[PDB]
Amino acid sequence: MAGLQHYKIAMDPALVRLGSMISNRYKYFRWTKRTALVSFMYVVVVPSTIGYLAYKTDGLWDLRAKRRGDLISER
Amino acid sequence: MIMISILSLLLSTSVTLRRDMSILFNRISIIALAYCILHDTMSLSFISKGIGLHGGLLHITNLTQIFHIFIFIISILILQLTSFYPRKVWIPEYSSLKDIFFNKILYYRTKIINKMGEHMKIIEYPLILLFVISGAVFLISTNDLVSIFLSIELQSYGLYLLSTIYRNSELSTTGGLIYFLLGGLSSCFILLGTSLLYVNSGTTSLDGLYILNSISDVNSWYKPYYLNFSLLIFSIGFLFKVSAAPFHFWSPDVYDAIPTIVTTFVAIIAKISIFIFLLELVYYTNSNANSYLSEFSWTYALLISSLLSLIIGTVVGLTQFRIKRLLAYSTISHVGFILLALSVSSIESTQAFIFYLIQYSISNLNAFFILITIGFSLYGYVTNNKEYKSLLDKNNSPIQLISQLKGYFYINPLLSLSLAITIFSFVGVPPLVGFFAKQMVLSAALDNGYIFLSLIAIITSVIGAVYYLNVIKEIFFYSPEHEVNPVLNESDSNFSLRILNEKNVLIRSVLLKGRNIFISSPFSITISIITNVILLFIFMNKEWLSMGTILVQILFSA
Amino acid sequence: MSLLYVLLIIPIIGIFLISTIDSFYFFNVSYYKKIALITTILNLIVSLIIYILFDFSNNQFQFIQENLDLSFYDIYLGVDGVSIYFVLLTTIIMPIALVSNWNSITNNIKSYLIIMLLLETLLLAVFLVLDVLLFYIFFESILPPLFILIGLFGSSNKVRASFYIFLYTLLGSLFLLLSILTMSSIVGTTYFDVLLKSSFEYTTQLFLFFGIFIAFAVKTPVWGLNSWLLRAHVESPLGGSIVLAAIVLKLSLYGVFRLILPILPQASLNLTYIVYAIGAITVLYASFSTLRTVDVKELIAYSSVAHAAIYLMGVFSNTIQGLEGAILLGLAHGFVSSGLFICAGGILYDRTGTRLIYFFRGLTQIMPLFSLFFFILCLGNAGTPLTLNFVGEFMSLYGTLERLPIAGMLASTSIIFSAAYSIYMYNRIAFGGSVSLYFIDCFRDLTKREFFILFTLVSFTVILGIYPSFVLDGLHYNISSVVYGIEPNASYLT
Amino acid sequence: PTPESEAFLAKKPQVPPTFDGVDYEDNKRLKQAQDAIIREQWVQVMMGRLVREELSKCYYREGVNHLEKCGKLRERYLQLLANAKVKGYLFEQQNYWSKEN
Amino acid sequence: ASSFVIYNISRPGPNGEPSSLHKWFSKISDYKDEWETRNTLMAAALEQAAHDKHLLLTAER
Amino acid sequence: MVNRILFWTGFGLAVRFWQLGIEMRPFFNRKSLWAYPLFGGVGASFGYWLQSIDEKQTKMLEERKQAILEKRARRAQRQAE
Ligand SMILES: CCCCCCCCCCCCCCCCCC(=O)OC[C@H](COP(=O)(O)OCCN)OC(=O)CCCCCCCCCCCCCCCCC
């Protein structure tokens, strides 16, 4: 079936059919309120949140050789 | 020399009606063009922006003479298709230099070599081809509005005649009719533009028009709107003839309808002449000072056509299934690059323009030669495909479908690799000559602030790459539908070959099979040289790129 | 003749011999594969010789050849510490990749060997060229052979995979090319020893960064630009997959050390938070989807995405340990992903003909040698100490933390999630019951071939996990040159 | 002092670690400066490494008493840790600074 | 056993003096100034080449 | 390594090889072996000729560079007023 002869496998049709659905699922995506909301949350909101937090704390702290009588804050 | 060859060939052709003379007449046209190269090679030992000739109606420049030679060389290469039979018989006992020069081989060749094929029996074909060449050389060298019109009609009329010279084909006669009808419309725009120049300026001289434009470029009674407006109408007729969008619709039908060997000449020769002629006209009308004239510059038609040719050429090619229509849309896309380099008038863009045109002409030449050679290689193959059986004018265009190339890598791998190298050069994959061509045009466009057009060029290139990849997928990723003919090699079907010496005395006899029939050497060698030029350009680029550098420095020499 | 040109020339000779030996002897395909393998061994021997002669603290490019015959596009070859280890990774991986496909390539064997040999020359030329436009030429040259390799030897979905990797890489690369051409116009060349002395103005740097970053994020790949990898790395033949994940992913990383760090320092520092948000998002999203991936080769392919996020964050850390850790992780990923692709795409796939996880269970009972190497490889993927993967992850993660703490803390969560998908995948295949009832025949354990490609790969990760000085010592001096910044009492000495 | 080894001298910088009065078109002179800035940073860094080594020996020597007997090394290491770092040459190559500013 | 043997014979000896093989490896990979000399010559040449192209590309129309 | 003569001698050899491969004819049969010295010889001729083009092209480009500098100089001296 794929080049070299492999061992006999009891290829279960249900499991094979599930594997085919996963390979072809992209062909059936549609924009709905649910899919748009999920896609917007994962792609825009969460990344922009980490981006905003990384932006606002960039350069805020330094630990190197900080003693008592000093601050971790740099800014 | 080109005029003497045409008249001498015409006279010999006039008193012959023998169709077996066609192959000989084609070979003489090759010899004639080699002399034309020799004379123009001798005419390159001066430096000038231009010398007017013959009462100022023509002119010569170093650039003019270089592209005269280039047109001759491309025409010699195309002329091989009608000067040699497509297939040969080769055996390892007739391979020595003494055998080739003193011995002879005798066998029944008529069916094997296709001696009486259609492209071998048109007596006037090399002659009409020379008429088109004369139209093209004259247009490069034209210094004058009347000379422009005469030259462009001469080249155009021969192209219409070439598209119809296969008079027994309904497809060919249809394409010739379409070319002539819409080409007649485009010629009217050229004549209209030339006429509006004359009625306003009172001169037919290109020198005089450039002088009037030069004085009018200062920073009220006869403000010179006419020059840009005339050249705009003038340029649209030339945009049709290079098949730039949106004046492109004719060429995918015409190139597909006419026979493939004709398409090779028809699709390549005309763009070289019109683009070279446009180059000088673009340089000498460029308004240096930002005045009102620059606002209405006729060269924006070139830039809009460039934009539209980038998009149409790549998008429409996505759903093409006929191989010759795909090449037509591939050319329109590549014309978009050429038009971008011409529109930006800079030393870098002119260098990019000159290099791009020559590399594109040799590459599109390699694609047509490989397509023809593949078509002539199926002689000893059979297919039971139902789609292939319903194709029209199979003899004129043996390969018409991309699907016909399915599994061709299993039929002939090195010829399939040559096709793949040529197509990857069209995409612009380094280090092929096509990448370096695209790279130079992008550089200049970015350096002169054409960023928006630079970005549309890269985006269209990815879209264009899709249908290029689709041809390659067909050749490599599948098994073929063609099988070797059982009877061509059936273990009992041997044809006889006699080997004889200079005294016509038999030396030996040998029995031969379909496995002893090969592509003729002129086509294999031409594909091989061009494929290796595309592939190995990175080691050979100095002199070729330096030639364009010197030519542009002369054209810009303040 | 330079030793670096010998490196590029040996595989071309082997291509010539493979394509002509039919005229001196139906030649057995074993002879073809012997020629290609010995060709890769000699290339490895040459790279070892170069490394023995290489000097660890020189800021001059070594083993260069004078040209004095300048043209428009001349190939200049040179090596320093930040490229020497990528050359070694390419020359060690290539023989292993050839042996991993010794039996599974059954048709078109000559074409397969010539593509792999040509891939060796092109990938090596990427690490050795001393010009930025030469880097693009070699980076893009590998696409047509890769397109053909996938399409001639790939699995059922090979056409869609071949198109994806070609069009994604081309599209990203076209934005890098525009960035390179702008540099070439401002400076007059892209030769390293000239461009690295140029100082681009800040706004130019910003628009240069975008365009180089777009390409490197397509090639990393970052999450959301990674479907080409999930297709191509799975549909590829096994030797293609090893080359694609061990060497081809490393191009964007070595590219950062030549194209961003020395010439775009101000844009790199000002945009690190955008790089870090993308790298942080990639670490979490790729990890969660790896946990739910049911194709065994796709699961190993998706874990490459999560590891490459950490070396990408380490390369933008602007700290010595983060930069060295990035190179260390890149190298350690090459040995581990090669071994896990061999385990899945070469051992499981050859035996069963399927890549679905649902059909595997309890393989330890009948395949103890496979389960031993598979487990050690899964610890490497989880970044377990004593592998070079821990050393690279720790140093990369420390530099990312010190540069931007919130980004490092999120990136650190990889220590939890890489373990999760590695241990989950190991347990479901090797453990998790008795031998799967879907197997009708019993399975043989590793053949000598499979044992000795896994043992060799496992050897490299463990030996370098215990003595990583073997790479770091040759990295320290050269990697100093890409750091940007100053100390107040250390700078401007008089 | 420990004699400067034959190997050490082969790599000793012949130029001061600075970019002032360095012609950037002189490839040899620029790379010499870059090497001098890099090497000087590493020396300061390797100095801290040696101080840390001495601090380690006294800690395991003085035990309970380390908080009182290891202060001199303690202070030295903190000073080096606060000041020494491999920062590269490339900011100082691109940015000239003056004391009189 | 081989690792123990090879490590012992490769030691610099009781005094810090390189062995016979140590002097060979140091000699073959000497390059006292070869890289710097060649690198400097190439950098200046491509510097000048960029100069020439800048002159030709920016020439006044 | 870009020695023109050796490169174009090699180019001619590669043309014959590719041509034989395209024709699906054997790469080396003894009575055909004269073709490789021939194709390589024609390649060597093309490259001795390219050598002399390069010499002329270099001189032309060197004269052009001087003219541009001379043009630049006089214009600069004209602006001195
Ligand atoms: C889960 C595994 C985890 C592994 C962790 C890694 C190990 C670290 C923790 C253990 C550390 C102990 C390492 C041994 C320390 C001493 C090494 C040694 O053998 O030294 C002797 C030899 C000569 O000594 P020398 O350095 O010259 O002293 C004079 C200097 N003037 O020096 C040498 O060069 C000899 C080197 C020979 C190899 C050393 C011995 C290795 C012993 C461990 C082997 C374990 C594997 C066993 C394999 C199967 C054995 C049946």
Side-chain angles (χ1 to χ4, degrees), chain A, chain B, chain C residues 1-25 28-68 70-494, chain D, chain E residues 1-14 16 18-61, chain F:
Chain A
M1 295 160 43
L4 283 180
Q5 180 180 357
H6 45 84
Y7 291 114
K8 268 111 172 53
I9 301 285
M11 278 300 222
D12 182 63
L15 295 180
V16 174
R17 167 181 343 114
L18 175 62
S20 53
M21 185 265 283
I22 300 160
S23 70
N24 318 315
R25 92 170 297 125
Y26 76 95
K27 297 149 64 172
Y28 305 86
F29 183 80
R30 293 177 282 103
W31 287 120
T32 66
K33 290 266 143 79
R34 186 193 128 71
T35 56
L37 178 61
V38 173
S39 300
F40 175 85
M41 269 291 341
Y42 276 108
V43 175
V44 162
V45 181
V46 169
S48 78
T49 279
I50 293 127
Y52 180 85
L53 279 169
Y55 186 64
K56 286 310 235 53
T57 51
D58 194 57
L60 196 48
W61 303 300
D62 170 62
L63 270 61
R64 178 50 64 86
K66 283 320 174 55
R67 316 160 189 233
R68 280 154 35 92
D70 205 317
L71 310 185
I72 320 186
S73 304
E74 311 291 311
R75 206 202 317 135
Chain B
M1 194 42 171
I2 215 182
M3 310 197 354
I4 305 164
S5 322
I6 287 161
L7 294 173
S8 58
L9 178 53
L10 187 44
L11 206 62
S12 297
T13 301
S14 297
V15 298
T16 194
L17 267 308
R18 272 179 60 176
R19 281 165 323 149
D20 55 349
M21 284 302 291
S22 304
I23 186 151
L24 276 176
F25 275 162
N26 267 280
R27 288 180 176 178
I28 276 149
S29 284
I30 299 203
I31 289 151
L33 286 177
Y35 281 107
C36 297
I37 291 157
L38 177 63
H39 302 146
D40 273 4
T41 293
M42 302 263 295
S43 69
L44 279 158
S45 22
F46 63 88
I47 307 297
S48 210
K49 299 230 189 177
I51 305 145
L53 296 173
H54 288 287
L57 298 191
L58 311 163
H59 71 94
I60 61 165
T61 75
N62 297 123
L63 190 299
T64 265
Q65 294 304 100
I66 286 309
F67 272 93
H68 277 4
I69 292 166
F70 183 62
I71 286 186
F72 298 148
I73 289 161
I74 276 303
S75 303
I76 276 166
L77 289 171
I78 297 175
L79 270 173
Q80 292 178 106
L81 306 157
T82 39
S83 301
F84 306 92
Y85 301 110
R87 297 179 292 280
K88 62 148 174 275
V89 144
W90 183 88
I91 45 176
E93 43 286 346
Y94 189 73
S95 40
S96 84
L97 256 182
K98 176 177 174 53
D99 285 359
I100 299 305
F101 281 82
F102 290 96
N103 296 345
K104 57 230 297 180
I105 48 97
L106 260 279
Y107 70 102
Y108 174 60
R109 312 160 93 115
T110 304
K111 298 266 251 150
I112 286 170
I113 76 179
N114 197 25
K115 172 158 90 168
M116 294 160 184
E118 199 104 26
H119 63 110
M120 288 291 138
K121 295 182 309 135
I122 299 153
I123 289 141
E124 313 71 25
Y125 186 83
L127 168 73
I128 287 151
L129 204 298
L130 293 188
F131 266 102
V132 179
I133 296 158
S134 60
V137 291
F138 268 116
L139 171 69
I140 290 329
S141 299
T142 283
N143 213 11
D144 179 70
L145 288 184
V146 175
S147 317
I148 281 137
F149 182 65
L150 294 178
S151 302
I152 194 51
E153 310 307 302
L154 180 67
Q155 171 194 310
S156 300
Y157 295 0
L159 290 168
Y160 309 148
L161 285 167
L162 273 174
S163 299
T164 323
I165 204 175
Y166 284 63
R167 66 184 285 273
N168 287 329
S169 158
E170 179 91 90
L171 255 287
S172 297
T173 55
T174 304
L177 186 59
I178 289 144
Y179 205 177
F180 169 90
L181 280 182
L182 308 160
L185 189 37
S186 81
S187 287
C188 284
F189 285 137
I190 292 172
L191 188 71
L192 183 59
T194 285
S195 82
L196 287 175
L197 283 168
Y198 170 76
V199 316
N200 273 290
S201 68
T203 176
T204 308
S205 176
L206 274 179
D207 253 325
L209 274 178
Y210 303 154
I211 304 278
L212 286 159
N213 180 242
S214 180
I215 299 156
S216 80
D217 184 52
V218 80
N219 76 315
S220 290
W221 260 101
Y222 292 90
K223 266 183 304 303
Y225 301 94
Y226 73 88
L227 184 85
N228 268 305
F229 183 100
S230 290
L231 291 175
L232 175 68
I233 297 175
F234 188 75
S235 71
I236 284 147
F238 279 109
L239 287 173
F240 173 92
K241 299 188 186 287
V242 295
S243 192
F247 316 97
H248 62 278
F249 297 100
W250 71 271
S251 93
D253 300 316
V254 176
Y255 291 171
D256 201 16
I258 68 180
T260 309
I261 295 174
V262 178
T263 313
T264 310
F265 192 77
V266 165
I268 290 180
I269 200 63
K271 277 154 221 278
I272 308 158
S273 186
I274 284 145
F275 281 133
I276 287 312
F277 164 81
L278 283 179
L279 174 68
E280 187 248 32
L281 200 292
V282 166
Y283 179 84
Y284 285 103
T285 52
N286 172 82
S287 165
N288 306 57
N290 311 330
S291 42
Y292 42 87
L293 299 185
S294 174
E295 296 274 275
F296 321 101
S297 178
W298 68 277
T299 51
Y300 304 131
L302 308 163
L303 216 30
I304 290 152
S305 265
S306 171
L307 180 41
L308 292 183
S309 318
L310 293 167
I311 282 137
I312 281 311
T314 62
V315 166
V316 183
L318 289 179
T319 54
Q320 299 303 309
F321 62 95
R322 292 186 53 84
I323 183 57
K324 285 165 84 205
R325 292 184 59 86
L326 189 47
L327 279 194
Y329 282 112
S330 152
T331 300
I332 295 162
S333 173
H334 282 284
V335 154
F337 266 89
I338 288 153
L339 278 175
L340 179 55
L342 179 68
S343 240
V344 177
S345 180
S346 78
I347 296 164
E348 201 180 9
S349 65
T350 309
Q351 293 176 172
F353 173 85
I354 276 147
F355 177 66
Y356 199 105
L357 187 75
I358 289 193
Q359 70 87 39
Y360 186 61
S361 295
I362 311 303
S363 295
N364 202 215
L365 192 274
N366 207 31
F368 277 102
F369 247 81
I370 292 158
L371 182 77
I372 286 157
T373 302
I374 283 162
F376 282 141
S377 82
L378 297 183
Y379 188 65
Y381 280 82
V382 290
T383 178
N384 273 122
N385 198 290
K386 217 160 184 295
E387 195 171 6
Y388 306 169
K389 182 188 298 153
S390 50
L391 291 174
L392 305 140
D393 262 331
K394 314 195 166 143
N395 269 349
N396 293 155
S397 290
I399 313 301
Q400 290 163 30
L401 297 181
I402 292 136
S403 62
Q404 275 173 287
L405 301 178
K406 188 205 308 288
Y408 192 77
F409 157 78
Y410 299 98
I411 288 143
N412 185 344
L414 208 48
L415 186 56
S416 280
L417 202 46
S418 295
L419 187 44
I421 292 172
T422 310
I423 284 157
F424 277 129
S425 199
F426 293 147
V427 188
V429 193
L432 307 170
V433 74
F435 156 76
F436 291 99
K438 284 190 175 177
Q439 173 267 315
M440 284 180 231
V441 180
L442 296 175
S443 304
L446 283 166
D447 215 40
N448 270 40
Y450 298 78
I451 324 293
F452 178 83
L453 254 287
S454 284
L455 287 163
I456 296 204
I458 68 169
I459 301 308
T460 60
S461 270
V462 185
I463 304 175
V466 173
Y467 64 65
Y468 287 131
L469 291 168
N470 255 316
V471 177
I472 291 170
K473 165 199 73 33
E474 197 61 5
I475 297 156
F476 282 87
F477 296 6
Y478 304 100
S479 268
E481 300 255 56
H482 290 91
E483 335 295 322
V484 152
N485 217 333
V487 297
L488 254 290
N489 303 275
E490 223 191 8
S491 85
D492 64 88
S493 65
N494 286 271
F495 60 91
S496 171
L497 187 157
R498 271 62 197 251
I499 310 212
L500 274 67
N501 54 66
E502 207 169 5
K503 305 196 165 191
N504 291 262
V505 181
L506 190 143
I507 312 164
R508 75 157 58 189
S509 284
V510 47
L511 285 79
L512 252 57
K513 295 280 280 304
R515 63 159 156 266
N516 302 121
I517 294 141
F518 306 90
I519 299 150
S520 280
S521 297
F523 315 112
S524 58
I525 289 175
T526 298
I527 292 152
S528 177
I529 288 173
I530 296 172
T531 296
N532 273 273
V533 170
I534 289 172
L535 195 76
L536 304 171
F537 168 77
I538 206 192
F539 315 109
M540 78 189 30
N541 55 72
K542 211 204 146 191
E543 282 92 278
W544 182 0
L545 278 186
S546 289
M547 161 182 88
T549 294
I550 292 144
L551 289 164
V552 179
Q553 284 299 304
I554 293 151
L555 169 73
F556 276 73
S557 178
Chain C
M1 176 142 167
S2 154
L3 284 210
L4 307 184
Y5 286 96
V6 169
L7 271 185
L8 303 193
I9 271 290
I10 286 168
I12 309 298
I13 300 157
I15 278 158
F16 166 76
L17 295 137
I18 281 174
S19 58
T20 56
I21 215 181
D22 262 2
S23 83
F24 302 144
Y25 280 79
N28 200 232
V29 307
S30 64
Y31 222 93
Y32 287 149
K33 312 185 309 176
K34 252 197 202 59
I35 294 143
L37 181 54
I38 287 144
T39 307
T40 51
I41 304 302
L42 309 162
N43 215 253
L44 185 270
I45 282 146
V46 168
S47 69
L48 283 184
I49 278 149
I50 284 148
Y51 183 76
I52 285 300
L53 305 168
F54 180 85
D55 156 37
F56 288 1
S57 48
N58 203 6
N59 64 342
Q60 297 292 356
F61 273 106
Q62 304 174 36
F63 311 105
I64 74 157
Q65 186 152 298
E66 295 204 318
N67 197 21
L68 301 179
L70 307 175
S71 183
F72 294 80
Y73 304 96
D74 305 83
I75 300 127
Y76 311 121
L77 298 191
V79 83
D80 60 28
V82 86
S83 61
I84 196 45
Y85 294 105
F86 298 110
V87 169
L88 280 177
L89 187 72
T90 313
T91 51
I92 277 143
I93 287 322
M94 272 327 279
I96 288 145
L98 271 195
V99 184
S100 76
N101 250 350
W102 194 265
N103 295 296
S104 36
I105 308 284
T106 74
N107 164 70
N108 286 124
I109 292 90
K110 247 191 73 172
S111 287
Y112 169 87
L113 297 176
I114 281 159
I115 289 169
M116 299 281 290
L117 282 187
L118 173 60
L119 272 202
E120 168 140 65
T121 298
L122 298 177
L123 289 165
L124 287 166
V126 199
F127 306 118
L128 299 164
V129 285
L130 301 180
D131 178 295
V132 144
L133 174 71
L134 265 182
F135 167 91
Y136 181 86
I137 284 155
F138 293 113
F139 199 104
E140 268 46 71
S141 70
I142 74 171
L143 273 206
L146 279 179
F147 188 80
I148 304 289
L149 184 63
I150 294 171
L152 258 284
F153 306 99
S155 30
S156 298
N157 260 76
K158 68 182 154 113
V159 171
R160 186 154 201 89
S162 64
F163 273 76
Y164 267 54
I165 183 157
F166 194 94
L167 297 160
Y168 259 104
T169 293
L170 187 60
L171 171 75
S173 82
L174 283 179
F175 281 103
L176 174 94
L177 185 62
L178 300 210
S179 209
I180 290 173
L181 298 183
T182 302
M183 283 166 180
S184 206
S185 276
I186 299 165
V187 174
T189 181
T190 58
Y191 187 70
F192 289 166
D193 281 4
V194 168
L195 173 78
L196 293 223
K197 308 181 319 179
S198 84
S199 310
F200 291 101
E201 156 280 334
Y202 174 77
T203 322
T204 302
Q205 286 189 49
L206 291 167
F207 270 111
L208 283 171
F209 191 96
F210 292 109
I212 293 169
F213 195 83
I214 294 165
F216 291 164
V218 175
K219 293 300 283 164
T220 291
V222 307
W223 179 88
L225 298 176
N226 66 297
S227 37
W228 64 266
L229 181 150
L230 292 171
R231 296 198 187 268
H233 287 215
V234 179
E235 301 305 317
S236 198
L238 169 63
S241 318
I242 283 146
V243 173
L244 272 176
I247 322 296
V248 182
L249 292 182
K250 301 325 139 43
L251 305 178
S252 68
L253 170 64
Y254 164 81
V256 169
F257 287 99
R258 301 301 204 197
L259 276 72
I260 299 97
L261 302 191
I263 68 200
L264 305 178
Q266 276 156 30
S268 169
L269 178 77
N270 261 355
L271 299 179
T272 291
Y273 79 98
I274 295 131
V275 171
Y276 270 13
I278 296 157
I281 278 285
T282 294
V283 158
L284 315 167
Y285 288 14
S287 277
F288 301 157
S289 39
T290 307
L291 260 189
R292 298 296 313 276
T293 297
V294 293
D295 182 313
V296 185
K297 186 175 177 192
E298 201 200 338
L299 195 163
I300 283 139
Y302 232 143
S303 57
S304 288
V305 173
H307 308 318
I310 311 285
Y311 66 61
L312 181 274
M313 292 169 96
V315 269
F316 286 100
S317 77
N318 200 33
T319 87
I320 273 296
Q321 293 89 6
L323 290 157
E324 281 193 314
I327 298 182
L328 263 204
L329 188 58
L331 301 172
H333 165 274
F335 306 121
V336 182
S337 70
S338 284
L340 282 159
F341 274 116
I342 287 157
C343 283
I347 291 146
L348 297 189
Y349 193 51
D350 293 12
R351 274 158 184 72
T352 64
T354 170
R355 256 177 290 81
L356 281 190
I357 202 44
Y358 313 119
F359 284 101
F360 297 87
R361 162 176 101 204
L363 267 46
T364 304
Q365 295 214 102
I366 60 172
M367 298 188 55
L369 284 182
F370 160 77
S371 68
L372 166 81
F373 280 131
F374 185 47
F375 182 68
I376 285 165
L377 283 158
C378 292
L379 285 190
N381 211 56
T384 311
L386 307 188
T387 58
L388 181 67
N389 308 66
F390 169 74
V391 183
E393 187 77 8
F394 192 89
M395 281 178 74
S396 301
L397 281 174
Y398 167 79
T400 305
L401 200 283
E402 188 224 83
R403 172 70 182 80
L404 202 25
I406 71 77
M409 284 182 253
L410 293 148
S412 177
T413 71
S414 71
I415 299 156
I416 289 163
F417 299 128
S418 81
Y421 54 67
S422 314
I423 200 86
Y424 199 28
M425 172 213 46
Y426 178 74
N427 267 59
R428 284 178 286 167
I429 291 166
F431 291 169
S434 54
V435 181
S436 148
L437 289 193
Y438 299 101
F439 303 165
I440 303 156
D441 319 316
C442 209
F443 294 3
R444 62 186 306 167
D445 202 352
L446 305 175
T447 66
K448 211 195 271 197
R449 200 189 38 92
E450 307 169 303
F451 178 93
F452 275 108
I453 56 182
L454 289 180
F455 179 82
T456 288
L457 285 175
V458 161
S459 281
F460 275 105
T461 180
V462 169
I463 285 145
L464 297 163
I466 288 152
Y467 206 68
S469 281
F470 282 142
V471 168
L472 292 157
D473 277 32
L475 264 206
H476 293 309
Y477 181 86
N478 284 152
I479 213 145
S480 315
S481 69
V482 284
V483 178
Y484 190 57
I486 38 160
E487 271 315 278
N489 323 290
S491 51
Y492 300 106
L493 300 197
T494 36
Chain D
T2 290
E4 310 223 336
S5 149
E6 199 187 336
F8 180 91
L9 295 182
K11 296 278 226 153
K12 175 142 135 282
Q14 308 312 285
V15 300
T18 174
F19 285 111
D20 311 84
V22 176
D23 184 14
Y24 282 30
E25 276 173 78
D26 189 349
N27 325 301
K28 198 230 190 153
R29 184 69 188 74
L30 191 61
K31 308 275 293 279
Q32 249 165 303
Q34 287 168 351
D35 173 91
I37 286 95
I38 293 313
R39 259 156 211 283
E40 193 41 45
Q41 303 168 111
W42 273 96
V43 164
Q44 283 328 287
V45 153
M46 270 327 95
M47 273 159 84
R49 178 175 299 189
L50 288 166
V51 178
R52 201 208 269 123
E53 193 165 353
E54 280 323 285
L55 189 51
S56 211
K57 311 151 119 202
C58 69
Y59 176 87
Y60 290 130
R61 179 177 56 251
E62 325 298 345
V64 51
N65 289 306
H66 82 88
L67 271 187
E68 191 260 291
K69 310 288 276 309
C70 288
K72 204 174 127 283
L73 290 156
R74 208 151 65 221
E75 196 52 55
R76 187 81 196 92
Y77 178 83
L78 277 189
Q79 289 247 280
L80 273 153
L81 191 65
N83 291 312
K85 212 152 163 125
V86 183
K87 280 297 213 155
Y89 59 70
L90 185 269
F91 186 97
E92 202 137 311
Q93 184 187 288
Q94 279 162 336
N95 285 297
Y96 59 90
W97 174 78
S98 44
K99 299 186 175 180
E100 297 90 20
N101 194 41
Chain E
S2 314
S3 288
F4 174 82
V5 164
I6 296 291
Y7 180 89
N8 268 47
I9 68 170
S10 88
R11 284 310 105 214
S19 90
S20 88
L21 212 40
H22 284 289
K23 293 186 218 121
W24 188 66
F25 272 111
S26 318
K27 178 191 148 165
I28 53 169
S29 42
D30 45 330
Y31 306 113
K32 292 134 164 91
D33 61 335
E34 192 96 326
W35 305 142
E36 167 274 308
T37 278
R38 312 225 263 250
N39 273 289
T40 311
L41 261 306
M42 270 297 297
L46 298 161
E47 196 83 335
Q48 189 47 238
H51 179 85
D52 316 325
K53 176 190 46 33
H54 169 221
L55 210 44
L56 284 189
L57 274 187
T58 55
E60 254 311 338
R61 172 200 294 252
Chain F
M1 304 93 57
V2 295
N3 174 37
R4 190 166 290 131
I5 302 308
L6 175 129
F7 167 79
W8 285 106
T9 299
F11 183 95
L13 297 167
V15 168
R16 178 61 178 180
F17 191 86
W18 269 79
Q19 174 222 349
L20 292 175
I22 286 161
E23 277 172 25
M24 308 202 91
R25 259 170 71 205
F27 285 128
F28 309 104
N29 69 275
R30 278 215 59 96
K31 275 222 298 163
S32 301
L33 279 202
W34 56 274
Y36 285 103
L38 186 269
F39 277 53
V42 177
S45 301
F46 192 85
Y48 278 113
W49 174 80
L50 273 185
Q51 198 165 321
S52 63
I53 302 308
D54 204 80
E55 185 141 0
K56 305 183 207 87
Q57 282 175 337
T58 283
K59 211 150 82 43
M60 275 210 296
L61 279 178
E62 198 169 86
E63 297 229 82
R64 173 71 182 136
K65 289 167 227 132
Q66 285 325 106
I68 289 148
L69 287 144
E70 275 134 50
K71 171 92 135 71
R72 284 185 74 51
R74 298 188 319 270
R75 166 192 279 260
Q77 202 240 319
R78 198 243 306 154
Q79 295 269 19
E81 313 141 5

